[PDB]
From a paper:
In Pectobacterium, iron acquisition via plant ferredoxin is mediated by the Ferredoxin uptake system (Fus), a molecular machine consisting of inner and outer membrane transporters and a periplasmically localised protease. Intriguingly, the outer membrane transporter from this system, a TonB-dependent transporter (TBDT) designated FusA, imports intact ferredoxin into the periplasm of the bacteria where it is processed by the M16 family protease FusC. To confirm the common architecture of these systems, we characterised the gene cluster analogous to the Fus from Escherichia coli: the ydd/pqqL operon. Furthermore, through structural and biochemical characterisation of the distantly related Fus homologues, YddB and PqqL from E. coli, we show that these proteins share key features with FusA and FusC, suggesting a conserved function.
In order to determine if FusA homologues possess the structural features required for protein import, we purified and characterised YddB, the FusA homologue from E. coli. YddB belongs to the outer membrane localised TBDT family and has been detected in the outer membrane and in outer membrane vesicles of E. coli in a number of studies. The structure of YddB was solved to a resolution of 2.4 Å by X-ray crystallography by molecular replacement. Based on identification of structural homologues using the Dali server, YddB is most similar to FusA with a RMSD of 2.2 Å and a Z-score of 42.2. As with FusA, YddB possesses a 22-stranded β-barrel fold, the pore of which is occluded by a globular N-terminal plug-domain. This fold is characteristic of the integral outer membrane TBDT family and like these proteins YddB possesses a hydrophobic transmembrane region. Comparison of the structure of YddB and FusA by dissection of their extracellular loops confirmed that the two proteins are structurally analogous; the eleven loops of these proteins share a common structure that is distinct from those of two other TBDTs, FhuE and Fiu. The capture of the large ferredoxin substrate by FusA was shown to be mediated by a large open extracellular binding site. Analysis of the YddB structure revealed that it possesses an analogous binding site, with dimensions (27.8 × 29.2 Å) capable of accommodating a bulky protein substrate of similar dimensions to ferredoxin.
Residue numbers in the entry: 29 to 175, 180 to 790
Write the structure that this text describes.
Amino acid sequence: FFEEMTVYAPVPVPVNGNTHYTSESIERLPTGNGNISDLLRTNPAVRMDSTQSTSLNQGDIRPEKISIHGASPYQNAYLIDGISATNNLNPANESDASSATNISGMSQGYYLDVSLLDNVTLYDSFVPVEFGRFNGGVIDAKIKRFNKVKLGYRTTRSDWLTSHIDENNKSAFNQGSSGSTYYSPDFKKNFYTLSFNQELADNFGVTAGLSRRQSDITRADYVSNDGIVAGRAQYKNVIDTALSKFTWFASDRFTHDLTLKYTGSSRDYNTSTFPQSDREMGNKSYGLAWDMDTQLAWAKLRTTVGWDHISDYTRHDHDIWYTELSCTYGDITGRCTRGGLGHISQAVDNYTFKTRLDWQKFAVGNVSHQPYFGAEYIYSDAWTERHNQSESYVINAAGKKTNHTIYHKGKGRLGIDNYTLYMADRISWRNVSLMPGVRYDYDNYLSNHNISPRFMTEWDIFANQTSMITAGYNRYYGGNILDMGLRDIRNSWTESVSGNKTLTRYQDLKTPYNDELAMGLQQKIGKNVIARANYVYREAHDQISKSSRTDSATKTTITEYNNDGKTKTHSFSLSFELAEPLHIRQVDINPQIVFSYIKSKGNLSLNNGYEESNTGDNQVVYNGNLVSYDSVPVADFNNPLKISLNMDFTHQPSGLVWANTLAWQEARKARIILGKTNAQYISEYSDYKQYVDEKLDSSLTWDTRLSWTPQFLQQQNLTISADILNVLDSKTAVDTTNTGVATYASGRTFWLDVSMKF
Ligand SMILES: CCCCCCCCO[C@@H]1O[C@H](CO)[C@@H](O)[C@H](O)[C@H]1O
Ligand SMILES: CCCCCCCCO[C@@H]1O[C@H](CO)[C@@H](O)[C@H](O)[C@H]1O
Ligand SMILES: CCCCCCCCO[C@@H]1O[C@H](CO)[C@@H](O)[C@H](O)[C@H]1O
Ligand SMILES: CCCCCCCCO[C@@H]1O[C@H](CO)[C@@H](O)[C@H](O)[C@H]1O
Ligand SMILES: CCCCCCCCO[C@@H]1O[C@H](CO)[C@@H](O)[C@H](O)[C@H]1O
Ligand SMILES: CCCCCCCCO[C@@H]1O[C@H](CO)[C@@H](O)[C@H](O)[C@H]1O
Ligand SMILES: CCCCCCCCO[C@@H]1O[C@H](CO)[C@@H](O)[C@H](O)[C@H]1O
Ligand SMILES: [Mg+2]
Ligand SMILES: [Mg+2]
């Protein structure tokens, strides 16, 4: 509806607030593990946490965190075919640790292998009324409709990866861990894909995508008090993906779709120091969706009936975790800790009922109107469970148990009703396009009536589509964190002597939101250059943070959640591309320059999210100065300037495609909290928290993918590809400890993949 200059460049970029990633572009770009986060790292609206996936943990194949326009990584709406696929149970808890209540999770409900998706669409700004419950952006994964059998093999290993490690981390890295932080010294990645589409009957068919991504990380199974490794074992990390879509083109009026979705993540861990501490930590999501499109003469009606199960779990091998003062395990003699703390889980089931009505285009004088309305109902069943009774204790040689704790078999469930109403009008007069809209959200979890005004306007300045300006104002209200209401039930299962149970105060919370002011320019320079300039301003208000206290008499820790967090972020992007690529001796060259600049100031850390507790600090000492906390730069997802030269080489006679991305990223600042002993500390300001920012290293990263399709074979069935990540083997310090011990980004990495079509 809005006029747009299509992206012919190597890397997709934001057009009118949205970026489209086709399967061609997902396959052409080197995407590592093939998680949606690998696809979106190149987007100028996105910032990753460079301290997350480092030289120390390339074995892990799970999806990574993404910040859109300064928003936190738990504030994005992840959807599959327009249906919510976001894990709102407790996305901030990523800890791989073992405990009675620890469960590792993230915001992505399904860890989807992107190589099976038809396309992925990211909305970063000018987001329409249909999308909601997010503070930063919307990621919409789309499933292919029948239109072919493809087999794909992809592999990599620790031998093909260069690890830049500080000498201080060498021992922990070789063992495979340091307490609850796990490393991947030795690993082998085998990824298998199977995709097919088959017409089953007249106007009826199905598409099925299956993917098994496995990483076998080798660590020490047992480490002694001395630090002596006794043996090594293989810890299976696997993500299974199963996607399927049935389409029945029943008639001119009706079209039916039935979608089956399933992602199975499973990771084996153990505590090196504790014998018999094996545990399976995982995440399982599956669901169904019946879509129906009814075409009438005056309007189009789209209905969706859906069910999704999103879960995370910890399943120890053992049910008892205990400390023997005189060890009876194997040949261990001293004090030893053995076992595990059973099986726990957390889940949310959504029952979705959506409707959208698209009225036919009509005129009121010379002003063209195309309105649309939506109504949605989502029932959420959210729960946490302790599957088996567990115990902990210290036992003496005689058999006397002390410091005994019992974890009781239990389950706690929550029922939530979510409603959505929305309407927008597509207004078009001459060279001006207008889309005014309003979205309404209500839930009985926080019981807040949320009104989101949504407005974007586009002006074709000369009406020849050479200069187009887009401006807009939009409000984005986020979703809920179900842990707040569920944790107390999980903490009540604990029966111990001096254990503080929890009381969580959250029902008076206002829903967190972003106000956005955005301006976009699409400009044709000369005959062959397309230039895109975008500015996005985001004010993040009523951001969730907390404060706590422990009460002795009642033996309770009272956490009171609040809306004290606030950030201001300025986002700028400048892109240059060619309408026509160069042609030299049959080699087609497609070049692109992308500038991305994101500066954010706030009184919180994005990684902390709703668990942030320092928002009550109105003032801080920052780099020797007593300043307002809101004026201080945000400490994470903080590499402000990004400059990229992207270049695709295509030589059809030889069946070769050469994709290259050269990315220069600005150094991030590592925040350090100063103690009274610190040389830079100021006693004058002792009543305030004091921080110093240490700038680290900038990174020049060259990622490449060389794809060969042997021309001798009829139908071009076979394709062999090589991916090289960080070709220059840049050594970049992503993070540093208080002592000065540095964490490094990953070094040169080689990926080999084969695909056969039939
Ligand atoms: C398509 C994938 C081709 C892989 C070719 C082998 C990659 C070699 O990889 C290199 O090997 C060196 C010696 O073993 C190591 O020192 C380097 O760290 C490693 O990057
Ligand atoms: C219909 C089945 C579709 C997927 C086919 C690929 C499954 C690969 O499966 C893998 O095979 C390996 C064989 O060496 C085993 O060692 C692994 O444990 C297994 O996960
Ligand atoms: C998961 C989908 C459930 C619906 C069952 C599939 C019905 C397919 O029905 C098909 O419809 C065609 C007309 O559209 C006819 O020409 C075919 O003979 C008939 O098999
Ligand atoms: C596609 C389905 C469209 C949305 C259906 C809206 C149903 C509204 O239902 C109403 O919700 C109120 C709020 O909890 C309740 O107080 C009322 O008792 C209930 O009937
Ligand atoms: C949170 C308490 C109700 C849980 C849902 C139970 C089964 C569906 O009952 C729902 O009740 C709502 C009223 O609250 C209505 O708005 C819905 O239309 C109705 O489907
Ligand atoms: C078509 C969509 C209809 C649903 C709109 C949401 C109406 C929310 O309405 C609210 O319902 C609560 C009960 O759950 C009451 O406590 C509130 O007083 C009432 O304002
Ligand atoms: C398509 C490009 C649009 C350019 C928009 C104007 C430049 C925005 O610039 C911003 O202005 C703010 C004003 O208070 C300052 O606070 C920011 O530091 C500054 O970066
Ligand atoms: Mg290596
Ligand atoms: Mg309330």
